[PDB]
């Protein structure tokens with residue numbers, strides 16, 4: 493499997509290179525983020541994540557913010573053409589471990605362009621109770637509110653621990669081609685994280701992977717349902 | 724099966740309600756077009772088709788033109804919410820019968836919006852030799868030029884008769900929902916039709932259908948690979 497991800501990491505796992513505080517990170521083929529940034533978490537408040545990449549600039553960048561408050565950013569120099577395959581699926585992923593949190597997605601948009609001019613764009617603001625244009629993996633599901641719940645949440649509303657789930661867009665994305673001048677993509681998603689216990693965990697991610705990607709075994713909690721190993 | 728289609732009909736089949744000349748038509752659940760318009764065919768010249776629908780206006784409209792020349796239009800009043808299911812696949816289809824024609828697609832774009840604001844948009848200008856975001860049916864394939872050939876064409880370049888093929892977009896489209904204020908879609912495609920023989924046949928169509936749609940049996944030639952019967 494080949495994962496490129498932007499992680500909202502709500503729980504620090506110092507035992508695997510994680511900084512000892514909530515952070516946003518850029519993950520290339522490994523949970524140990526190539527670049528992290530301090531995440532000013534606001535549990536209970538709706539947040540927005542924006543992700544951008546351009547094949548000429550070769551800089552993968554992400555920003556996190558809450559309405560009427562300071563934002564935080566992270567960037568990493570990388571040629572994803574030498575990392576990812578030509579065809580990929582894009583998705584959201586989330587996990588809980590010992591510590592719980594709701595991982596609610598209120599909206600999710602993605603745009604990709606490939607000049608050789610081929611484009612794909614999708615935007616979800618309400619998720620149907622049966623999203624045929626989404627591949628739901630793990631414990632991911634959509635509630636009556638039209639929200640996408642990535643991890644387990646009881647009928648009451650409180651999150652469950654040791655949960656893992658993901659949502660992929662159904663159509664593969666031609667992320668780059670050998671006969672391409674420039675390829676670019678932008679993604680955004682709005683999230684709501686609520687936690688009853690003290691420390692929230694584990695986090696939410698946006699990820700690009702090979703088409704046949706699925707939740708690898710033992711990828712719960714700290715590994716955000718993307719990687720089978722910490723290495 | 725449930726078909727809504729815009730047909731570029733290059734060969735008149737009067738024996739099934741067809742007007743006795745090349746025409747553009749709007750087809751609702753039947754090859755016998757609810758509305759047709761005179762098509763000023765120009766074989767060998769690249770043409771463009773544009774299709775539009777809005778759930779408030781309830782008027783499905785289509786236009787055909789060639790560069791630097793007069794265009795032709797057709798429209799039909801219809802509530803597609805009462806015709807189509809909520810989830811559909813969009814595709815292109817083409818056939819040949821006794822008389823042949825190349826059915827080349829140079830570009831294909833589609834946009835759909837569903838306010839309840841969910842959107843899907845895709846645009847193809849070059850078709851990969853292995854389009855994983857397309858479902859190719861019948862004899863449909865992509866050539867080295869990056870063009871989408873819907874019907875059989877020999878290694879030389881001349882078209883074959885009794886051919887049928889279609890290309891669907893991989894992801895289903897939430898075309899309408901019960902909790903929707905307005906739904907709309909726009910589609911466009913650029914085509915090249917060349918024919919060695921006298922009269923070209925049979926035509927090209929853009930169609931919206933149920934997700935599990937496939938080429939029905941005995942839908943060759945006049946039926947444009949959409950319908951199993953003329954009724």
Ligand SMILES: OC[C@H]1O[C@H](Oc2c[nH]c3ccc(Br)c(Cl)c23)[C@@H](O)[C@@H](O)[C@@H]1O
Nearest residue numbers: 548549550551552568569570571572574
């Ligand atoms: O050393 C390996 C490669 O590094 C550079 O290309 C890049 C790989 N990732 C990048 C990220 C940003 C930029 Br700007 C460049 Cl220019 C690169 C260039 O120096 C290449 O010539 C070189 O093959």
Ligand SMILES: OC[C@H]1O[C@H](Oc2c[nH]c3ccc(Br)c(Cl)c23)[C@@H](O)[C@@H](O)[C@@H]1O
Nearest residue numbers: 779780781782783799800801802803805
């Ligand atoms: O008679 C059946 C229906 O026809 C109209 O609705 C439409 C069905 N297809 C259309 C196409 C265009 C327009 Br404009 C309308 Cl207003 C419609 C309305 O008159 C409806 O009240 C009625 O139930």
Ligand SMILES: [Ca+2]
Nearest residue numbers: 501503504505
């Ligand atoms: Ca962590």
Ligand SMILES: [Ca+2]
Nearest residue numbers: 732734735736
């Ligand atoms: Ca005909």
Ligand SMILES: [Mn+2]
Nearest residue numbers: 501510517525
């Ligand atoms: Mn981390």
Ligand SMILES: [Mn+2]
Nearest residue numbers: 732741748756
């Ligand atoms: Mn006709």
